[PDB]
Design a protein around this ligand. Sequence first.
Ligand code: XQM
Ligand code: CA
Length: 164
Amino acid sequence: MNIFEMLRIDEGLRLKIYKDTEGYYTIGIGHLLTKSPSLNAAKSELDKAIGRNCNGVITKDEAEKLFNQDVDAAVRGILRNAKLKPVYDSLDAVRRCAAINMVFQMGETGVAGFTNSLRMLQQKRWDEAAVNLAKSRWYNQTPNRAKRVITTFRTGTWDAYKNL
Ligand SMILES: Cc1ccc(I)cc1
Ligand SMILES: [Ca+2]
């Protein structure tokens, strides 16, 4: 597929504010609104993001536009990061999608502990990288999604997403 199809499978689509797997207010195709426990704070973030008063509900077009912005922000964060860019540029197109997927889910700060995984990926030691990537809170907390992403890094194919 492509990064949009991959993340749409992993994140789903919901048009009303929901909570992600960590309990944080989210909307659309996995768009984090806030880590605050305040629903009103999440609603304010939503209105700011969409540019109108939504009271917690968006259209599919709005969800898809937010998603495009979020994917682009993940790519640009990789390209501006001196640690991530060299690894990203060493990867083929399918594995670059796996990298964007992780940055979309965890952000640049969430991936900061993956330094050894990043080195193994740049060295193209795929099985070793796959084992190392699984030794993570990420894998333990979202194992099905992590297994799909790890299989993508291990094989360089879309097999985990076609199988699903
Ligand atoms: C975990 C991870 C972070 C950034 C890249 I580029 C690849 C893998
Ligand atoms: Ca999961």
